[PDB]
Amino acid sequence: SDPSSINGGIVVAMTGKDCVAIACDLRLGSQSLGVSNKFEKIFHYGHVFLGITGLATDVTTLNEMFRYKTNLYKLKEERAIEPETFTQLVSSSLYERRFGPYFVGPVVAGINSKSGKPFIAGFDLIGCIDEAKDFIVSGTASDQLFGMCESLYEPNLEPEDLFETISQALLNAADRDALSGWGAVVYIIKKDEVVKRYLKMRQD
Amino acid sequence: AGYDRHITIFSPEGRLYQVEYAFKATNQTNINSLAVRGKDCTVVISQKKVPDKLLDPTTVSYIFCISRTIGMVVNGPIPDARNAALRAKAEAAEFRYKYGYDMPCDVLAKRMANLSQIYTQRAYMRPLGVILTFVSVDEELGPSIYKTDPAGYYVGYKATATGPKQQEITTNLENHFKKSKIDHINEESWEKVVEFAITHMIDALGTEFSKNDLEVGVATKDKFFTLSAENIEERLVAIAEQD
Amino acid sequence: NSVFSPDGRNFQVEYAVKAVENGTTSIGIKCNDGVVFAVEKLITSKLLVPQKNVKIQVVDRHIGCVYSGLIPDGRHLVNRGREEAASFKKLYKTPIPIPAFADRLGQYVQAHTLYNSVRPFGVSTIFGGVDKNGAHLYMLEPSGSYWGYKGAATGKGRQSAKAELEKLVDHHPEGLSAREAVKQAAKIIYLAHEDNKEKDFELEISWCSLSETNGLHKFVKGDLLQEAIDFAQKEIN
Amino acid sequence: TSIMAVTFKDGVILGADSRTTTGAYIANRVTDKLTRVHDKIWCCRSGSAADTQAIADIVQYHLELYTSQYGTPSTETAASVFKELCYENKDNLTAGIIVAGYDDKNKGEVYTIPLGGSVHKLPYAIAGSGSTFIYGYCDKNFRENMSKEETVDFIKHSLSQAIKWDGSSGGVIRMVVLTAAGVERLIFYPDEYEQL
Amino acid sequence: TIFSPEGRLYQVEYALESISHAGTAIGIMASDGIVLAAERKVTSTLLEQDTSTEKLYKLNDKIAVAVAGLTADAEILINTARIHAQNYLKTYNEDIPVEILVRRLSDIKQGYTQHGGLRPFGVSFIYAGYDDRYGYQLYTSNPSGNYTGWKAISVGANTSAAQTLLQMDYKDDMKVDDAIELALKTLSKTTDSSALTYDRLEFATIRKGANDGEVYQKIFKPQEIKDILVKTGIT
Amino acid sequence: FRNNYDGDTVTFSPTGRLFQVEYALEAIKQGSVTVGLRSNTHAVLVALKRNADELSSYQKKIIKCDEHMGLSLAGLAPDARVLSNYLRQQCNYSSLVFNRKLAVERAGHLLCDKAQKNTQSYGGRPYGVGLLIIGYDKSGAHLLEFQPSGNVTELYGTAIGARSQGAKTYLERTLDTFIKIDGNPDELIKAGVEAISQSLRDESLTVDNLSIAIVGKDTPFTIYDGEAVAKYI
Amino acid sequence: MDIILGIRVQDSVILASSKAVTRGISVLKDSDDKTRQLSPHTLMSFAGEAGDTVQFAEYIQANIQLYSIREDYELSPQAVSSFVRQELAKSIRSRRPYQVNVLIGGYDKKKNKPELYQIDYLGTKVELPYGAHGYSGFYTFSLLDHHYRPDMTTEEGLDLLKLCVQELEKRMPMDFKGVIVKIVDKDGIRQVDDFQAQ
Amino acid sequence: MTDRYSFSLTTFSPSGKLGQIDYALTAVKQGVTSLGIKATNGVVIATEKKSSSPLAMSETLSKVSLLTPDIGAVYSGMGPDYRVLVDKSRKVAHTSYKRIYGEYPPTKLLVSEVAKIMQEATQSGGVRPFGVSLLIAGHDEFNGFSLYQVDPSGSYFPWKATAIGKGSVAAKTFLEKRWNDELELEDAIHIALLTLKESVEGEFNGDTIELAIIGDENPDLLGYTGIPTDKGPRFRKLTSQEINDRLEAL
Amino acid sequence: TTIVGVKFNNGVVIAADTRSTQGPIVADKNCAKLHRISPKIWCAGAGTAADTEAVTQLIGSNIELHSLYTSREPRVVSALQMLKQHLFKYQGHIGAYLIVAGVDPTGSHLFSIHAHGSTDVGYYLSLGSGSLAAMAVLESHWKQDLTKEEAIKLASDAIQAGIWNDLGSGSNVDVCVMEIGKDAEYLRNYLTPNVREEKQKSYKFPRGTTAVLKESIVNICD
Ligand SMILES: [Mg+2]
Ligand SMILES: [Mg+2]
Ligand SMILES: [Mg+2]
Ligand SMILES: [Mg+2]
Ligand SMILES: [Mg+2]
Ligand SMILES: [Mg+2]
Ligand SMILES: [Mg+2]
């Protein structure tokens, strides 16, 4: 059937005052059968964070490919890739597979280590960049995420408050999606430090 | 016989003897040519020597119409000349197809110089033994002269001259532009610019020309064309009534 | 071959030409509505079958080709001339103009003076025919060089043939008809044979005339040939 | 689309409506369907706009290269290039092209190249979806060696009927006149031609 | 590529000849780290030191090379070595074992030695790496495509003299800090310059991550080389 | 003049000569003699087969190309095989596509053009074999001579190989007689067999020595060897 | 549908694999070993389309064995599983994709821990305490959610497995002719030759 | 049709030299002097327009070339080799960088790409090395200003200041004398002009000298307004007139 | 999507709305459909969003290289020729529909390109799901020789027809003005008539509202 429905999965990123947050559920399914309670969908190359939803084989493949490409970048350039630049590299990487696309909905979060300004972006499966300054959503419960976010969001939240907001968005959207859920993970990202929290959610 | 004289590799002095030899090849036909710019035209003049009386003189030319707007005069043996002409024509048609507009004179010359530089660097190609002079009235730059040699070198000229007796003609024109202080001929008609060209050719080389001794190409806003014997005879008549 | 000498020459092409000079003498003559081609066929032995070692070649329907030098090289050119004429006719519908055809051979021959992996052609070719606007006669040397001709000769008797050719141009500035030029071709081929008189020869003639062949290329055979042989026989003595 | 070319005494004239549709929406009411591939060789296009534009652009390229080497191409040469492309690619093209030209020797000539890729030399040619409604009218009114003004009238009347019945045809009637003169662009607006 | 009557590869020999004119590079391996030191080719005051890295290159996060010979050839090879490390990481989710990367580079060199009639790369490498199978390692590879493992080695000029000295003062139980001193002493003795100063030097270590349990590469900034040059008493 | 001008087939000598091709011509002169001749009704090949020892077989010199065509060889034998296989295919091609027997003259032209490409391509030698081709097509009996230079000539008769100049002089003399030998296969062969004899400083041509081939009006191309040539010795 | 189960206990990984090979209306075999040893301490089991199954297994086995001899070293279970995933990942977008699902059970001598990898034909990899491919998982995942403990002995693991095989024998519509059971630990791979009535 | 020299035309000699690379360097020596000077807030690259004829129009031949909006190049050696290197360099900045990362390459990376193109002409079959040395000056957000020399062998080196070509030895001396790390761009242009006067034979003015800077962003050179984070090129070719103003105070 | 193109006496103006959609859901409430081929040639895309961005960037890239190679300002006919030749090659599979507008040494130009590779020329153009809403405005108010101000007003009004009447379009109006003498002026959010009203309530949660299973600090560097 629909390749972006087989495994289930949601990712959401928000910006706040001097921070970004990125969150994902933990489920990995095979249609109705829940298979893994531990499948993370967020990654990080230096201080740049990438969540990916969709077909899990492509999630894995793209993580390995962006590790590869950022590793080489860092060696040639002698510095870590920035949010804005990585976003570009993801886009061109996806479009390169225009007629055999990866079935994924990537989401990029991070803070520019020069300007210190919070950055998030979304993509479709062929690399079309969704530039948004507030929140980005992806996955089999994206409708529910859009609803939750548009209602709950307000700009310039403190890292401790942005945490509540993104978590509440994720949990409740996940609870209306039969293919999302089974545990969640939330990253809060401030220039200087990154805290990671596992949430307690329904296990059904 | 060292390799550095048979192919385009460097000699201990940093020279490419095959490129140097290719320059000598350009004089082999013992034909001289010159180009000048008018106010809104560009004129090329070249000698036309037809030694053999078994030749059809109309098929003896070293002037080519590359496009509707670009003309090219060659100094060098005709086999190589036609090779270059054919290429330029193809490069010109293709440019127009791909970019939606007529290929400019200088751009074509740059392109031909790039092809030449390749023969200068790759071992299996010999340079062409020809010097290419390109002329037009560019839609952006106005009347134009650009000239490419076997080294892959090219530049624009106020006026230029090429061939064995090229130096005579050059210093003649240098003396003219020292006098006038401008970089063209003030002149309205292409007919009078052609006359100037033919006149200054005569002094520099110290020779008279009949209508069959000459070959003329003229480029005006949007055509390039060549003059027949008759249009040249008319031009020769006009110079005689004063000079 | 891709080698320029210190003074701008191509010794390999120059040597190619000596192979041409070594060859049999062949000619072409431009009459007022067509072209005549003639060639000297050296008879090595009586064992050679007469009329049956045809040197003159047709390209498309309207072009004739004759050459001196290494015969195989000439055949190689004519093969390429034919591919090149088919290609043109295919895209453009009309049979190839003679100056157009000239340049095709020109470029191909010139190509073989650009690379060390190739030797220049060991021929000069006299060719031509009738197109949309008149008759044309061409001669193409090993270097790629070619020009339009009123008359042309190449090979052993090249010098004496040109001398005869030059005379005709002077006495007849107003035209020479196709039927006339055929006769004169036979004559000139007799008057270049004088050099190779130790070995016997055979004469081949072809023509391409608007009024006489309707612009197609045809071999001069039978009574027309015999009559031209007589004219040359009577005018040699 | 309504397109036609007509040979007359002094040369040839091309005519076309100016409408382009996607379904029942008029994407362009002022299209120039008269396309120059050489100074005095022009064509009218029907079928796929993408296909025919791409074809016209290749032909224009071939004839420009042709003029550089061999001089003015004949109309027949222009038709042959069109046919080559259309025939060799009949199984990716929906292209129906009418070719019309003028040279001093052969005067005015018309070639029609329908869907298959075949060529047909004709005294006049009609094509496009609006042409179907004017087969009777054209066959009944065309004569050889008409004057310029007579020919212009014949196209004007023919195309106005084609426009009247075919919903894909409409707008203004454009014409191109091809003679020794000269190239002449004509235009006729609905307020004139509807009253015919 | 062809063999000689002697059974030698002309082009390889001459490539090695070329390298013996390159600034000496030294590699010394200790139990708790590895030292890479190399001397820059007779420079100039106007040469930018801060934005220069001609003889030392990072391969992945756990491997580096010191170069002797044609830099431009070395960059070609470094780049492919970098890709090979990333391919292995992508295939196995493990950092490439040091030997496997060295063998691959060496095999590319061997190839130019056996087919294609291209000139060999005029490059000799000293590899300095750490992996969880053999710990700290030191390897050498030359234009022949041969490679060998060492505790201390030099490439480029004066290897002959530098090798004898290292043989003298090298002891299996050395700490990194002792190996640092040995490398600089050895360069100082063998230099065709007067003083061996900071601006004629590239220097790097692979240690046990200051205080951690992880492995860390330090490519010495110019200022660091000046300090470590006073410390070991050469000012 | 002779110095650095025989490196490859891609060099002209200052005299305009191609030494590689001239040297390939010398391999023919080295080969065992062979004779071909024809009248209006038949064409005959006669070849002197050569052994390499007294315990060896005489190596074959006549190859069939089609029902109406075949050739004899002198010079490098593997080259004869390469060339005859090409000719076999060209004959075959003409039959399958056009239902047409290949004109012997066209076979001449084709072989000539094939030889030519090896007189112009760097790093390839010319063919080192001379061939005599006979056939009966829609215009009668034909005989061709093939030189590695590419020159093919139609003859009434000829010979190639070592000491071949003898046979050639005889055939030049016999011309008016053998051209007329029509409807008599056995007389033409006996005329050809005696023609090859003029070329013997050798020995007496034995029943192994002799190789005869025939083709004509109502005879397919056929080869005679061993016992079947006895009656012509 | 082919039963393919794996359970990771405290000091070992246990693989159990159905013995039947069925084509059409016929059971052609009741002793099929759906396993390949990849290295002394790594075992892989497989199920999927008729031909690709063994062809894939043996191809991986050839590769891992090549590696071992080249490096005189045994690749960690985690590296072998990554190699396997990538091969399947490349395969899914190829002309004719391998239709094989696998379990990789390995004992990692450098960490002294057992490891179980479930990878499907798409190249979806995940490390699990217990796993299954095909329909069997629809029964066994819930049972093991209940009965499984992270500190079980190999012997407890075998009881838990027997419990899984009993459920399948009761509820699965097909006759899979029992399983072949294999244990991977520090002392390598060994087969429990009695299980069918143990 | 088809190459015969599919082998390296640059080979090692018994002594370890690579002849062809040596001989290309000898070509660079014969060429007109060019130079680069790095300042605190910019880079300047300068050279002499040596003309083939007084009938030539020297404005039509640029020796100084924009490579990207922030990188520029100058050379000494064989002009046509430069010209085609410039074409390849511009293209490679797009194909290997901008089409991937949506931004222009930093200086060192582009220089590295150029070096690779030249390295290859030193190893591939049937080619000679390029007869040029380039000076590449540029700016990027994370590295600041830089100046690189690139040699026929493929070698590059970063410079505070340097000169290549004819009078290079004397000019390099004149730069060691004058260079320091507090130089403003205006001071550097002034030094570039002085250094170039020793090299120039004939006339020394805005017509015979070619000079470009990597300085500050030129929004007036951008061609569009509206996007505030796009500020324009840092590469800027000085005009004939602009040069002459700094020669009357020289 | 609503994209329009309007020629005036001394130049050309293009405009677009700022809504992107996946089916019925609005992904971006304020993106930018106005793209740059070169400083004075600008582009608007409808259809496959990734396709119009990519075909714009590729051709933009090549146009820059052409410009540098030829020492000339890029022309609109070059952008048009490259786009249509590319799109045609991909038979449609690159769903880029574009209004390309700009000024070059030869005057001012306005063109449309469809995904299969056909081009048209005109004084006023519209594309997108809002195309019809916009065109009815354009057919109602266009005249020959509009002043700059009128052309902006018209184009702006046409995008509003799309915004208010087409569910495929919404949010804001971007404009770009290209005049023959001047630098091209990009005018981001020229109109913003769709401001979200202040919400009825604040949804910020009391800290500790979310149950947390475990936690750890994450390492960024090395
Ligand atoms: Mg969704
Ligand atoms: Mg749920
Ligand atoms: Mg060569
Ligand atoms: Mg060369
Ligand atoms: Mg002659
Ligand atoms: Mg209608
Ligand atoms: Mg709306």
PDB file of N, CA and C in Angstrom, chain A residues 69 73 76-79 81-82 84-85 88-89 92 112-114, chain H residues 97-103 105-106 108-109 113 140-143:
ATOM      1  N   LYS A  69      27.805  12.287   4.768  1.00  0.00           N
ATOM      2  CA  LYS A  69      28.005  13.558   4.080  1.00  0.00           C
ATOM      3  C   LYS A  69      28.453  14.671   5.004  1.00  0.00           C
ATOM      4  N   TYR A  73      31.969  16.657   5.060  1.00  0.00           N
ATOM      5  CA  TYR A  73      31.869  18.105   5.077  1.00  0.00           C
ATOM      6  C   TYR A  73      32.854  18.655   6.109  1.00  0.00           C
ATOM      7  N   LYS A  76      36.662  18.538   5.194  1.00  0.00           N
ATOM      8  CA  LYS A  76      37.066  19.474   4.145  1.00  0.00           C
ATOM      9  C   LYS A  76      36.978  20.909   4.630  1.00  0.00           C
ATOM     10  N   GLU A  77      35.935  21.201   5.398  1.00  0.00           N
ATOM     11  CA  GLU A  77      35.600  22.574   5.787  1.00  0.00           C
ATOM     12  C   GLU A  77      36.246  22.987   7.098  1.00  0.00           C
ATOM     13  N   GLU A  78      36.554  21.991   7.930  1.00  0.00           N
ATOM     14  CA  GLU A  78      37.129  22.180   9.272  1.00  0.00           C
ATOM     15  C   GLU A  78      36.179  22.934  10.214  1.00  0.00           C
ATOM     16  N   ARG A  79      34.900  22.570  10.141  1.00  0.00           N
ATOM     17  CA  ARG A  79      33.845  23.088  11.013  1.00  0.00           C
ATOM     18  C   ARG A  79      32.563  22.274  10.836  1.00  0.00           C
ATOM     19  N   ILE A  81      28.663  21.506  10.110  1.00  0.00           N
ATOM     20  CA  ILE A  81      27.590  22.018   9.260  1.00  0.00           C
ATOM     21  C   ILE A  81      26.567  22.802  10.105  1.00  0.00           C
ATOM     22  N   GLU A  82      26.081  23.913   9.560  1.00  0.00           N
ATOM     23  CA  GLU A  82      25.062  24.712  10.237  1.00  0.00           C
ATOM     24  C   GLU A  82      23.638  24.315   9.797  1.00  0.00           C
ATOM     25  N   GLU A  84      20.987  25.930   8.449  1.00  0.00           N
ATOM     26  CA  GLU A  84      20.656  26.432   7.108  1.00  0.00           C
ATOM     27  C   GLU A  84      21.335  25.665   5.963  1.00  0.00           C
ATOM     28  N   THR A  85      22.609  25.326   6.149  1.00  0.00           N
ATOM     29  CA  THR A  85      23.385  24.631   5.126  1.00  0.00           C
ATOM     30  C   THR A  85      22.947  23.176   4.977  1.00  0.00           C
ATOM     31  N   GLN A  88      19.747  22.753   3.154  1.00  0.00           N
ATOM     32  CA  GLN A  88      20.036  22.752   1.737  1.00  0.00           C
ATOM     33  C   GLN A  88      20.556  21.407   1.233  1.00  0.00           C
ATOM     34  N   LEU A  89      21.418  20.759   2.021  1.00  0.00           N
ATOM     35  CA  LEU A  89      22.018  19.487   1.624  1.00  0.00           C
ATOM     36  C   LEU A  89      20.983  18.368   1.642  1.00  0.00           C
ATOM     37  N   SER A  92      18.665  19.009  -1.717  1.00  0.00           N
ATOM     38  CA  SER A  92      19.302  18.581  -2.961  1.00  0.00           C
ATOM     39  C   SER A  92      19.457  17.057  -2.985  1.00  0.00           C
ATOM     40  N   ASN A 112      21.941  28.127  14.867  1.00  0.00           N
ATOM     41  CA  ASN A 112      23.123  28.631  14.181  1.00  0.00           C
ATOM     42  C   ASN A 112      24.159  29.030  15.223  1.00  0.00           C
ATOM     43  N   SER A 113      25.353  28.454  15.131  1.00  0.00           N
ATOM     44  CA  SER A 113      26.357  28.645  16.169  1.00  0.00           C
ATOM     45  C   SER A 113      27.096  29.969  16.016  1.00  0.00           C
ATOM     46  N   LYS A 114      26.766  30.732  14.979  1.00  0.00           N
ATOM     47  CA  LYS A 114      27.308  32.075  14.826  1.00  0.00           C
ATOM     48  C   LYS A 114      26.258  33.085  15.267  1.00  0.00           C
TER      49      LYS A 114
ATOM     50  N   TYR H  97      29.321  22.482  -5.472  1.00  0.00           N
ATOM     51  CA  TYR H  97      29.062  23.217  -4.240  1.00  0.00           C
ATOM     52  C   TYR H  97      27.723  23.944  -4.116  1.00  0.00           C
ATOM     53  N   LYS H  98      27.459  24.896  -5.006  1.00  0.00           N
ATOM     54  CA  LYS H  98      26.251  25.701  -4.896  1.00  0.00           C
ATOM     55  C   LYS H  98      25.000  24.887  -5.179  1.00  0.00           C
ATOM     56  N   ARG H  99      25.089  23.982  -6.150  1.00  0.00           N
ATOM     57  CA  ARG H  99      23.978  23.107  -6.485  1.00  0.00           C
ATOM     58  C   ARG H  99      23.739  22.063  -5.401  1.00  0.00           C
ATOM     59  N   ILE H 100      24.639  22.007  -4.424  1.00  0.00           N
ATOM     60  CA  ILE H 100      24.494  21.073  -3.327  1.00  0.00           C
ATOM     61  C   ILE H 100      24.079  21.768  -2.028  1.00  0.00           C
ATOM     62  N   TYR H 101      24.795  22.838  -1.674  1.00  0.00           N
ATOM     63  CA  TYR H 101      24.645  23.494  -0.368  1.00  0.00           C
ATOM     64  C   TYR H 101      23.898  24.820  -0.428  1.00  0.00           C
ATOM     65  N   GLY H 102      23.516  25.226  -1.640  1.00  0.00           N
ATOM     66  CA  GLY H 102      22.781  26.472  -1.855  1.00  0.00           C
ATOM     67  C   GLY H 102      23.566  27.737  -1.549  1.00  0.00           C
ATOM     68  N   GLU H 103      24.886  27.621  -1.406  1.00  0.00           N
ATOM     69  CA  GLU H 103      25.747  28.784  -1.164  1.00  0.00           C
ATOM     70  C   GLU H 103      27.059  28.627  -1.935  1.00  0.00           C
ATOM     71  N   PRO H 105      31.161  28.290  -2.631  1.00  0.00           N
ATOM     72  CA  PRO H 105      32.214  27.658  -1.843  1.00  0.00           C
ATOM     73  C   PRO H 105      33.086  28.663  -1.098  1.00  0.00           C
ATOM     74  N   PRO H 106      33.555  28.299   0.107  1.00  0.00           N
ATOM     75  CA  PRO H 106      34.585  29.122   0.721  1.00  0.00           C
ATOM     76  C   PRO H 106      35.849  29.076  -0.150  1.00  0.00           C
ATOM     77  N   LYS H 108      39.210  28.326   0.251  1.00  0.00           N
ATOM     78  CA  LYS H 108      40.122  27.165   0.254  1.00  0.00           C
ATOM     79  C   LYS H 108      39.567  25.984  -0.551  1.00  0.00           C
ATOM     80  N   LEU H 109      38.253  25.779  -0.464  1.00  0.00           N
ATOM     81  CA  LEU H 109      37.616  24.663  -1.150  1.00  0.00           C
ATOM     82  C   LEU H 109      37.638  24.852  -2.652  1.00  0.00           C
ATOM     83  N   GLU H 113      39.600  22.760  -5.565  1.00  0.00           N
ATOM     84  CA  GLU H 113      38.991  22.240  -6.776  1.00  0.00           C
ATOM     85  C   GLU H 113      39.825  22.614  -7.995  1.00  0.00           C
ATOM     86  N   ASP H 140      35.060  34.386   2.923  1.00  0.00           N
ATOM     87  CA  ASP H 140      33.877  33.645   3.344  1.00  0.00           C
ATOM     88  C   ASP H 140      33.561  33.887   4.825  1.00  0.00           C
ATOM     89  N   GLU H 141      32.286  33.726   5.189  1.00  0.00           N
ATOM     90  CA  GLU H 141      31.801  34.058   6.530  1.00  0.00           C
ATOM     91  C   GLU H 141      32.658  33.464   7.651  1.00  0.00           C
ATOM     92  N   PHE H 142      33.076  32.212   7.490  1.00  0.00           N
ATOM     93  CA  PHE H 142      33.736  31.481   8.566  1.00  0.00           C
ATOM     94  C   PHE H 142      35.264  31.506   8.551  1.00  0.00           C
ATOM     95  N   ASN H 143      35.881  31.935   7.452  1.00  0.00           N
ATOM     96  CA  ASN H 143      37.349  31.902   7.357  1.00  0.00           C
ATOM     97  C   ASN H 143      37.945  33.286   7.280  1.00  0.00           C
TER      98      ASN H 143
END
